[PDB]
Design a protein around this nucleic acid. Structure first.
Ligand SMILES: Nc1ncnc2c1ncn2[C@H]1CC[C@@H](COP(=O)(O)OP(=O)(O)OP(=O)(O)O)O1
Ligand SMILES: [Mg+2]
Ligand SMILES: [Mg+2]
Ligand SMILES: [Mg+2]
Lengths: 680, 105
DNA sequence: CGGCCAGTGCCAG
DNA sequence: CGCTGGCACTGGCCG
């Protein structure tokens, strides 16, 4: 086993030069540095470790180092270099699995200060390498009279860079050993720094294997990117910006501007008693002035103010105009500010008709800015992330949620507006295989969208089969459960029938329930009874969870103090799943189960396609474009191939279900089309 | 003796009035404005002959002040023949105003 | 005036 | 007590 780390001139997207590399061989216990001129030698060393059936450890190598070395090998040396997935170990992947209760900076992409809780120390030092090296650069630099530029600390190699590289390996090694010391994932009988790759995956907890495979596949997905129609979105921006301009015109005619205190630098004091009056706007006393054209005197105080135009985006402004119009809030916030959301906005009533109608313009205005913000103006807007290849390469953290679910960001391709919502079809149609032209033929590609049917209800069925002998599981397989739940709860749409149950099943209050299905707390109660009564096994399951985790707890003030017997649960693959709160214990169980099922699923799916002879990549037959929890979107070179993907996705799901001996049959539904609009 | 303006009455009551007009842009929430009000009441009785004191409440009439660059309050704009002749900002003393007036009328 | 940050509210599974 | 997440926009604070 060897630990390694490399330094390059840029991010994967445009890396073009290998600076240096360090390798620590457990077999010799020595560190070896490699400078620019040693690139071929560094690569040989890695392949030597592979020829021995060894292991190579990197910290975040699945997303950067490994795929960067392949690219750099072809560009700088005309060499074909491909480390096999089975030989690589990633401490970031490991760290995220064994310390899943903690956040991380995603290797410096996030600021540690805005992250909740504590951070694992070694991993922290690793994610801050660049910034620390940069600060040293600007320093060593300015102490020379030079000027710092862009990010010049990365354009050329240097011994300062070499030392950090060495330091990373020494820290990554320390991080490795601390993770390998967790007896729950790695049995203490084996010395994992001294065994071949086959032994590492077979003797360690199954989760270690599943997390590395998922990570290897999702890094590929990130590299495939999602075909995006820029022209369609730029033209959508124009429509919305125009509609936005008009609503502002209308609103700013209805609600006029006003003045506010600003720049007061002195407490106002009563002229007679000298008593301070904090509640009054601060003032300002001239000094000087007293023909004297100047517009000030001397002991004549005034109150500095500013002119402010109505801003529909400001909840403060809205709340201020509607009260003046006659509204009296009934719902306030912790800080005493009134609640202004679509829910209350839809129920606000006033006299002035123009003002009342204005409210809709306000709701439409906010919704439109929600769209413009995500697609065009916001920091993470689509139009800002579209790469040169006409694809958006969104980032994915395979194990960012406590439950084992993945997290998506920059931008979050997992929060794109649904087709059944304002402007969703246009947003949705903008992402799609049709927007990718084949490298050879030039013809458009096709999309294959597969989604796991009634996933978490089947997960519930599985866990309550030991209480109801498999009954819930039986009823599930009798037509769409969400549609059979819709009519039952006399609900409108199927999406809403889904929102209901999942709010119901994870302990949502009677009011919360009634709101969703949107009557009073009376409705959201008869409905909790009707369904909770139509299935008492859910009550048994809940008690076990409690009797297994909690010992007892108080309620001392606005918080919670609990005495646990054990504060985590065992996942479908044996990992520990942290339970933050007794009331959410059930959710943790089902969400975690669903997540692990979908993770093995996409893994098994791509594995079966490559087995059927298919090549993964835009230069092949299919390409993973996105994975949204229990849904995958795959681009296919021909209709024929999309037919196979779909068929194959169903085979893999049934496989997973058998793998973990699930007490509820698992199923998938696939659609073939040109984009995400038609494929979901 | 004091005139109370509105956005719609401003033009003819001020910009088309004969002689001098002393306009006060004020607001209920300002301490300095509350201090100067008393003074203005007396300045009205006294200059009843060669001056018209008129007030405009900036909250109830949001359209006029903007056109004048109101930056602080109370603001005292002295109009003559529909044109701003003078201007001073703050709670002048009864004794300082009279001067400002005398030295401008 | 752009960076930091709290308070809020919406988008998806 | 819905719970997992990301993220945008307002408004107070400060170099
Ligand atoms: N509002 C919610 N609260 C909690 N969990 C939810 C909520 N909505 C969805 N989930 C969970 C259920 C399983 C997972 C994906 O759900 P998805 O949206 O695919 O529906 P589903 O899988 O239950 O059924 P379908 O066959 O209609 O897609 O996310
Ligand atoms: Mg590194
Ligand atoms: Mg599904
Ligand atoms: Mg889905």
């Amino acid at each position: 086993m060897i630990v390694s780390d490399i330094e390059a001139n840029a991010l994967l997207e445009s890396v073009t030069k290998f600076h240096c590399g360090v390798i620590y061989d457990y077999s010799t216990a020595e560190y070896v540095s490699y400078r620019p001129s040693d690139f071929g030698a560094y690569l040989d060393a890695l392949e030597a470790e592979v020829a021995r059936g060894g292991l190579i450890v990197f910290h975040n190598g699945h997303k950067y180092d490994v795929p960067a070395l392949t690219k750099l090998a072809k560009l700088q040396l005309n060499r074909e270099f491909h480390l096999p997935r089975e030989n690589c170990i990633d401490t970031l992947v490991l760290s995220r699995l064994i310390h899943s209760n903690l956040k991380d900076t995603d290797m410096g992409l996030l600021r540690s200060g805005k992250l909740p809780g504590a951070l694992e120390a070694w991993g922290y030092r690793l994610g801050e390498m660049k910034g620390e090296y940069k600060d040293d650069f600007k320093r060593m630099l300015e102490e020379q009279g030079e000027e710092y530029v862009d990010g010049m600390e990365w354009w050329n190699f240097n011994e300062e860079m070499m030392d950090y590289n060495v330091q990373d390996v020494v820290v990554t090694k320390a991080l490795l050993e601390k993770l390998l010391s967790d007896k729950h994932y790695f049995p203490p009988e084996i010395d994992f720094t001294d065994v071949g790759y086959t032994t590492f995956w077979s003797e360690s907890l199954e989760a270690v294997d599943i997390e590395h495979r998922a990570a290897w596949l999702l890094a590929k997905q990130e590299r495939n990117g999602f075909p995006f129609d820029t022209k369609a979105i730029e033209e959508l921006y124009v429509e919305l910006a125009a509609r936005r301009s008009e609503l502002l015109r209308k609103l700013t005619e209805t609600f006029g501007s006003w003045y506010q205190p600003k720049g007061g630098t002195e407490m106002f004091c009563h002229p007679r008693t000298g008593k301070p009056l904090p509640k009054y706007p601060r003032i300002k006393t001239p000094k000087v002035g007293g023909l004297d054209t100047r517009e000030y005197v001397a002991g004549a105080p005034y109150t500095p103010v500013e002119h402010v135009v109505f801003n529909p985006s400001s909840r403060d402004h809205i709340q201020k105009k509607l009260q003046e119009a006659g509204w009296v809030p009934t719902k306030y916030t912790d800080k005493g500010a009134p609640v202004v959301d679509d829910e209350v906005l839809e129920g606000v009533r006033v006299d002035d008709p123009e003002k009342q109608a204005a409210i809709d313009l306000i709701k439409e205005y906010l919704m439109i800015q929600k769209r413009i913000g995500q697609s065009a103006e916001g920091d993470k807007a689509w139009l800002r992330y579209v790469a040169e290849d006409g694809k958006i390469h969104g980032s994915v953290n395979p194990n960012g949620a406590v439950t084992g679910r993945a997290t998506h960001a920059f931008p979050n391709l997992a929060q794109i507006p649904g087709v059944r919502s304002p402007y969703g079809e246009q947003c949705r149609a903008a992402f799609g295989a049709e927007h990718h032209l084949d490298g050879i033929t030039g013809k458009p590609w096709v999309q294959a969208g597969i989604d796991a049917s009634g996933l978490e209800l089947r997960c519930l069925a599985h866990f309550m089969a030991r209480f109801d002998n498999g009954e819930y599981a039986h009823e599930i397989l009798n037509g769409d459960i969400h549609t059979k739940n819709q009519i039952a709860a006399e609900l409108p749409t199927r999406d809403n029938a889904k929102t209901f149950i999942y709010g119901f099943l994870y302990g949502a209050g009677d009011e919360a329930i009634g709101q969703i299905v949107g009557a009073g707390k009376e409705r959201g109660k008869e409905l909790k009874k009707k369904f909770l009564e139509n299935t008492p096994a859910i009550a048994a399951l809940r008690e076990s969870i409690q009797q297994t985790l909690v010992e007892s707890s108080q309620w001392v003030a606005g918080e919670q103090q609990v005495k646990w017997k054990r504060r985590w649960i065992k996942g479908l693959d044996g990992r520990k799943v942290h339970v933050r709160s007794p009331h959410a214990a059930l959710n943790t169980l089902l969400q975690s189960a669903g997540a692990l099922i979908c993770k093995l699923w996409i893994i098994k799916t791509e594995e079966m396609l490559v087995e059927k002879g298919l090549k993964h990549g835009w230069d092949g037959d299919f390409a993973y474009m996105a994975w949204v929890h229990d849904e995958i979107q795959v681009g296919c070179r021909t209709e024929e191939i999309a037919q196979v993907v779909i068929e194959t996705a169903q085979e893999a799901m049934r496989w997973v279900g058998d793998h973990w001996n699930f007490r509820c049959l698992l199923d998938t539904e696939g659609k073939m089309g040109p984009n995400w609009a038609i494929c979901h | 003796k004091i005139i109370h303006l509105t956005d719609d009455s401003f033009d003819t009551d001020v910009l088309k009035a004969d002689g001098a007009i002393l306009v006060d842009f004020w607001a209920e929430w300002c301490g300095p404005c509350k201090m100067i009000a008393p003074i203005l009441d007396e300045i009205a009785d006294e200059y009843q002959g060669k001056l018209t004191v008129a007030k405009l409440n900036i909250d109830q009439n949001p359209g006029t002040a903007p056109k004048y660059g109101i930056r602080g309050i109370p603001t005292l704009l002295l109009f003559k023949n529909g044109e701003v002749a003078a201007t001073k900002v703050g709670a002048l003393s009864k004794g300082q105003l009279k001067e400002f007036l005398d030295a401008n009328l």
